Write a protein that binds this ligand. Sequence first.
Ligand SMILES: [Mg+2]
Ligand SMILES: [Mg+2]
Ligand SMILES: [Mg+2]
Ligand SMILES: [Mg+2]
Ligand SMILES: [Mg+2]
Ligand SMILES: [Mg+2]
Ligand SMILES: [Mg+2]
Ligand SMILES: [Mg+2]
Ligand SMILES: [Mg+2]
Ligand SMILES: [Mg+2]
Ligand SMILES: [Mg+2]
Ligand SMILES: [Mg+2]
Ligand SMILES: [Mg+2]
Ligand SMILES: [Mg+2]
Ligand SMILES: [Mg+2]
Ligand SMILES: [Mg+2]
Ligand SMILES: [Mg+2]
Ligand SMILES: [Mg+2]
Ligand SMILES: [Mg+2]
Ligand SMILES: [Mg+2]
Ligand SMILES: [Mg+2]
Ligand SMILES: [Mg+2]
Ligand SMILES: [Mg+2]
Ligand SMILES: [Mg+2]
Ligand SMILES: [Mg+2]
Ligand SMILES: [Mg+2]
Ligand SMILES: [Mg+2]
Ligand SMILES: [Mg+2]
Ligand SMILES: [Mg+2]
Ligand SMILES: [Mg+2]
Ligand SMILES: [Mg+2]
Ligand SMILES: [Mg+2]
Ligand SMILES: [Mg+2]
Ligand SMILES: [Mg+2]
Ligand SMILES: [Mg+2]
Ligand SMILES: [Mg+2]
Ligand SMILES: [Mg+2]
Ligand SMILES: [Mg+2]
Ligand SMILES: [Mg+2]
Ligand SMILES: [Mg+2]
Ligand SMILES: [Mg+2]
Ligand SMILES: [Mg+2]
Ligand SMILES: [Mg+2]
Ligand SMILES: [Mg+2]
Ligand SMILES: [Mg+2]
Ligand SMILES: [Mg+2]
Ligand SMILES: [Mg+2]
Ligand SMILES: [Mg+2]
Ligand SMILES: [Mg+2]
Ligand SMILES: [Mg+2]
Ligand SMILES: [Mg+2]
Ligand SMILES: [Mg+2]
Ligand SMILES: [Mg+2]
Ligand SMILES: [Mg+2]
Ligand SMILES: [Mg+2]
Ligand SMILES: [Mg+2]
Ligand SMILES: [Mg+2]
Lengths: 195, 113
Amino acid sequence: KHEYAPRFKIVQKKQKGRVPVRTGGSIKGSTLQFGKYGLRLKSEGIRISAQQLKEADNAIMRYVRPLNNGHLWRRLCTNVAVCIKGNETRMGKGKGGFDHWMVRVPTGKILFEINGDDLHEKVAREAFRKAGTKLPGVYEFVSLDSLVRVGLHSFKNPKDDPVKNFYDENAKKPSKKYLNILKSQEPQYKLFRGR
Amino acid sequence: SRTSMKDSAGRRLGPKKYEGQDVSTGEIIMRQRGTKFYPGENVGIGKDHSIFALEPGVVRYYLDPFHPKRKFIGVALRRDLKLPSPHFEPTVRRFGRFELTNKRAAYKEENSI
RNA sequence: UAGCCUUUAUAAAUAAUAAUUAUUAUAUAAUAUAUUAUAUAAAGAAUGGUACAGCAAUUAAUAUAUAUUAGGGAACUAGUUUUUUAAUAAUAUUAAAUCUCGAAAUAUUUAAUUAUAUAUAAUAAAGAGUCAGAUUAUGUGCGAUAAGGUAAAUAAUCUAAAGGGAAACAGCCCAGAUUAAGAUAUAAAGUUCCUAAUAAAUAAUAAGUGAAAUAAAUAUUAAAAU
RNA sequence: AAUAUUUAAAAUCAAAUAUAUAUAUAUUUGUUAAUAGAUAAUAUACGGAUCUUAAUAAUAAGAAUUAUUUAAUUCCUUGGAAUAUUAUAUUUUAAAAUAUAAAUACUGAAUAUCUAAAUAUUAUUAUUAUA
RNA sequence: AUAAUUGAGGUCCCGCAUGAAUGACGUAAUGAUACAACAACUGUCUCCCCUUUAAGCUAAGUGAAAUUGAAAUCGUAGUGA
RNA sequence: CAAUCUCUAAUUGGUAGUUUUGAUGGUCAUUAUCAGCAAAAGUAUCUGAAUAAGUCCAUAAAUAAAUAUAUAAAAUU
RNA sequence: AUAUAUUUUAGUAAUAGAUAAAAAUAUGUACAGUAAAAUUGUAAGGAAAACAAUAAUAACUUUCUC
RNA sequence: GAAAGAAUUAAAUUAAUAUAAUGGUAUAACUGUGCGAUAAUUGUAACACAAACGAGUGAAACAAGUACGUAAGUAUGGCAUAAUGAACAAAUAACACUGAUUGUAAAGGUUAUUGAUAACGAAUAAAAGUUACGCUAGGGAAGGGUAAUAUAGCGAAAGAGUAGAUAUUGUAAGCUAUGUUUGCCACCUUCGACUCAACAUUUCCUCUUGGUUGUAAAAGCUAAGAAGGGUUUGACUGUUCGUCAAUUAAAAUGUUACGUGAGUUGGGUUAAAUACGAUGUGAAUCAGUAUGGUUCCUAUCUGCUGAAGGAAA
RNA sequence: AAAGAAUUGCUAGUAAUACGUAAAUUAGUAUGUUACGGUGAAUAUUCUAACUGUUUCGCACUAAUCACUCAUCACGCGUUGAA
RNA sequence: GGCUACGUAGCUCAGUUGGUAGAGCACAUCACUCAUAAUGAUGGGGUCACAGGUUCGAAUCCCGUCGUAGCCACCA
Ligand SMILES: [Mg+2]
Ligand SMILES: [Mg+2]
Ligand SMILES: [Mg+2]
Ligand SMILES: [Mg+2]
Ligand SMILES: [Mg+2]
Ligand SMILES: [Mg+2]
Ligand SMILES: [Mg+2]
Ligand SMILES: [Mg+2]
Ligand SMILES: [Mg+2]
Ligand SMILES: [Mg+2]
Ligand SMILES: [Mg+2]
Ligand SMILES: [Mg+2]
Ligand SMILES: [Mg+2]
Ligand SMILES: [Mg+2]
Ligand SMILES: [Mg+2]
Ligand SMILES: [Mg+2]
Ligand SMILES: [Mg+2]
Ligand SMILES: [Mg+2]
Ligand SMILES: [Mg+2]
Ligand SMILES: [Mg+2]
Ligand SMILES: [Mg+2]
Ligand SMILES: [Mg+2]
Ligand SMILES: [Mg+2]
Ligand SMILES: [Mg+2]
Ligand SMILES: [Mg+2]
Ligand SMILES: [Mg+2]
Ligand SMILES: [Mg+2]
Ligand SMILES: [Mg+2]
Ligand SMILES: [Mg+2]
Ligand SMILES: [Mg+2]
Ligand SMILES: [Mg+2]
Ligand SMILES: [Mg+2]
Ligand SMILES: [Mg+2]
Ligand SMILES: [Mg+2]
Ligand SMILES: [Mg+2]
Ligand SMILES: [Mg+2]
Ligand SMILES: [Mg+2]
Ligand SMILES: [Mg+2]
Ligand SMILES: [Mg+2]
Ligand SMILES: [Mg+2]
Ligand SMILES: [Mg+2]
Ligand SMILES: [Mg+2]
Ligand SMILES: [Mg+2]
Ligand SMILES: [Mg+2]
Ligand SMILES: [Mg+2]
Ligand SMILES: [Mg+2]
Ligand SMILES: [Mg+2]
Ligand SMILES: [Mg+2]
Ligand SMILES: [Mg+2]
Ligand SMILES: [Mg+2]
Ligand SMILES: [Mg+2]
Ligand SMILES: [Mg+2]
Ligand SMILES: [Mg+2]
Ligand SMILES: [Mg+2]
Ligand SMILES: [Mg+2]
Ligand SMILES: [Mg+2]
Ligand SMILES: [Mg+2]
């Protein structure tokens, strides 16, 4: 509903920033969560405007609405407010006025997701290709068995990466603050703190 | 047009004296906005929460179990002392005065009340 | 005026610059469950909150044949069910210059030790010039993730630096001309000829692709792996 | 053969290094190409010539492009050893045997060394005449 | 009006932003004023040709000038304050 | 009266000497807070600010609270 | 029971607690305590007036008691 | 087993803080309450932080006095970071320091206090415009870069096309090229006509060819090759352009310092004169209108057009 | 708390009357209607509005002054000038 | 920083040299009239500008501030 037009109470101008190249191997929003088939970015990290996303959504919908129990999950919201000065105006003299909403999209991230009752995968693939024709990146069809993109030419299965209880790890190799707290909890300090 | 071209300068609010550093009485160990560091052993605190040394010694940053979730800056009277000092041991104190070996000076001091 | 430069000196002078030690844990050995030594591992005294990472709280976004709160319809005889409309909850998933609960490296930075003394800091007495900067790389603000653009941050060079390379070249890659000499090591860059110097190996290309200034979505044809 | 993906060393396998060690653990490395798309005004414009090799047939050429490498090739631990190569000499019948060598690729600065000369400072001398 | 007119004259009045001695309006005459039309005329032009004289050119005599870092002073492309 | 001299006042582009900031098409110039600012400190531009500041707050809630009531004392009665 | 005199009371006014998030003295010092939101209710009361309620007692001290 | 106390643990700084925002604050810096109303006091302040100077900030300690607290102790205003202004000249007090011959005085000094210079390190007590009649010293304290726009192309194809997205058409969004427009940057300080044109091809005509239920024919439409040859004359306007008239096989689009002023012109743009409308108190002014109106050059080199001499043939 | 501009009735058995009485309409209700007596006054014509009959003069009115009637302006359709 | 003199009703304005709550004015209702107004009469609201004293007695004097502006001072 509000993914292409956030309702920040205090509307305000924003700096340009940069699209996060996720050097640490994030895989956040790079996985199929809601649907069966999806459309992910394949190229370098890119900014997608609100209008472009809306058009991609519309393109996908043409295939989704005919389906029985058809659904489209829009995974990303255009949260960054972009202002622009005109091409007509000189440089300097303040910042330009609000123009459009935009989203910073890392390399591996999923944009859309679909799942119908009577949806064959070929149709879904076609729809997602047609959606990709309207967006500024280069995109890729992603199924539930197809594995998570991280880099431009690199891949990963989330099933593989290890599970860890971090409290236990902390206890094993404790910080100074934690040790101080533990000492405080002990009786030779707790009795004589005198509050 | 109307531009937002106005800002105060930076308040120089780092630590002004570091761990293991020799100090003198009066010297500022920390400038800060509110007690990020609390005044520890042999150390005072000012109006602007500025930690300053009460005695000559060695600046030490530490945690104390009595005050968990609070960082401290104190001044150890020597380099030998671990400045979160043992609680039930006697306080390491500095006399900090000198006897008036000079006779006249001693006499003057005796006279003065 | 300070910053940076110069001259002449001063010491109960190393205070300077660089690194190490400093911590945590493990194993072994020796003393009294602790201490010391040895070895190994760990981005390893103190200060920090950027990258990264994250969705906690704040601010924002999405979904539920899930629950509650009311509303609009609807079927039988005000009660009731369903298809729901919003809010709230629950569960799952997401991001931000002014969010950071996790969190680097570089950094700031302390003592002693070692190494730099044909070397540094500090102080004293005196002379300046300069206050139009430029480019390259990285991280940003503005611009349109435009400018040989603009604004500052860090480093280098040019400025004021000749020499070799980059065809030619202020700012790039090497390297700092006291005067020669030209045997030996070479730097960056090169070795068919122009032009100082070359021979090999294994693959791929057939397009003169390309051969020191890489042009995109997409299409076609192959090639591998499943 | 056919259909449909992916173009990957994360997983997986293979290979190598480091800790107890014929194994385990940890780390490091290995996963497409071509063409089209293609484009303006003095004149082709990799700096220019020119560069993709070919048996018969050469004491002889066969990228001068792209990618990964080496300094003849293969094992052992920069070094030695073996292997064939190449060149040469000797002996025997243009070939065979023996042995010697080459294997340090090279060019390259006003860099460094060497080789000499000058000035300045530091530290030692020698000669001649605040010695 | 012209084959055809952003010009000219006539007329209309959302006069962006006329107006009465910073005078208002309509005429006769005048004007090397400005714009437009008709007639006549023509080398203005279609489209230039021929001719004449003074230069230009050559020989003799006299004899400038601005300019000038030094010049042994080509094209193209590239580079580059 | 008026004229002249001396003093005093009004008026003056008549006339003379001067000036017309730095930044911009009325707005910005001093101070504070955050971001920009890249985990010390500092850090700019006609950069972004739901930006904020030229202050505000005081002489006041008092007095009374142990020898007391008739009579007699004054070792506390 | 009633008359006069002399007194006494009635000026009727909130805090009764070291008060603790209604409003009021904004700098000192001493002593002490904890807010808010949301939720469930309740006369007018309704989304929005007020009041109530809404985390855990292991160990310790004293008291009574099987 | 029960009651009471002491409390501890968890959570919380989301409330509250005189006031912005940030940091801090429950050990509370927040809140209540007693006393008080004092420390919102007086002389010396080292040493630090910050820092060009001027200033700014924290502050141990010594001495005098005060308030609260049993005491320990705490208080030199406010949880902190804004809340501001130099000298000079005046003014008011206190100080007992100087007292221009001596004594008084005046006047100056010391100490405390007063009002502003916001262009906020403040030039004076006190200062606005105009010039196209201008003058001097200097500085530059279309080309180049860019490609948002513009022009052209490509991919994908919603949708028109009597039916069929792709004969022809092709929304909004996607990927490029160009340097032809309007911009931006600031390294770098004249429009049109005439004359002669050279080059490009993204081709308007002519030649060849593919597609065209939308090629029967003929006219077309669209696309590929193709730059050999050709591609206008008039009315209006300074105009390029545009409107129209009459033609043409066609009347293509650019580049060349938007080719060409040491080749011509000078209508536009343009200074001095003048008027009009508007603006201004005015001098004068204008992304206004109108009439008038100033540059010249014998060619040294390059280059090109022709013509000779010398030369090695 | 005897009532503003204004406005109603009444010259005699009338008005006035905090003087009463009756009937018609009803099953029933009079502050109304129609009738009866009782007691009983005050005032008085010259000026002006109106409205009836009289008259003078006037009259462009005759559905008779709510009469008739004049011009611009506005709406349509002709005609003829100027240019 | 000091010194003035003014601020009645919804509108305009009296009143002022003390023993007052008064005018027309525009506004809503009836009134004579083919109908409508002009004209006649219904009534309307003032803390006599916030707010204190002296005379049993002040809207008027002595004023504590509010509003909007003058004036002086200071103007270094
Ligand atoms: Mg991130
Ligand atoms: Mg700041
Ligand atoms: Mg200087
Ligand atoms: Mg040292
Ligand atoms: Mg940041
Ligand atoms: Mg943290
Ligand atoms: Mg500068
Ligand atoms: Mg630049
Ligand atoms: Mg220079
Ligand atoms: Mg150089
Ligand atoms: Mg240098
Ligand atoms: Mg040198
Ligand atoms: Mg090529
Ligand atoms: Mg190239
Ligand atoms: Mg691996
Ligand atoms: Mg070319
Ligand atoms: Mg080359
Ligand atoms: Mg050398
Ligand atoms: Mg016309
Ligand atoms: Mg004409
Ligand atoms: Mg007149
Ligand atoms: Mg006049
Ligand atoms: Mg005239
Ligand atoms: Mg004349
Ligand atoms: Mg001659
Ligand atoms: Mg050069
Ligand atoms: Mg003048
Ligand atoms: Mg920060
Ligand atoms: Mg910062
Ligand atoms: Mg910092
Ligand atoms: Mg930093
Ligand atoms: Mg806060
Ligand atoms: Mg410092
Ligand atoms: Mg200073
Ligand atoms: Mg306080
Ligand atoms: Mg406060
Ligand atoms: Mg002055
Ligand atoms: Mg005297
Ligand atoms: Mg100034
Ligand atoms: Mg200034
Ligand atoms: Mg000044
Ligand atoms: Mg001035
Ligand atoms: Mg003029
Ligand atoms: Mg269709
Ligand atoms: Mg489009
Ligand atoms: Mg250009
Ligand atoms: Mg072509
Ligand atoms: Mg045909
Ligand atoms: Mg031909
Ligand atoms: Mg031109
Ligand atoms: Mg020319
Ligand atoms: Mg020229
Ligand atoms: Mg003339
Ligand atoms: Mg009665
Ligand atoms: Mg009846
Ligand atoms: Mg009667
Ligand atoms: Mg009669």
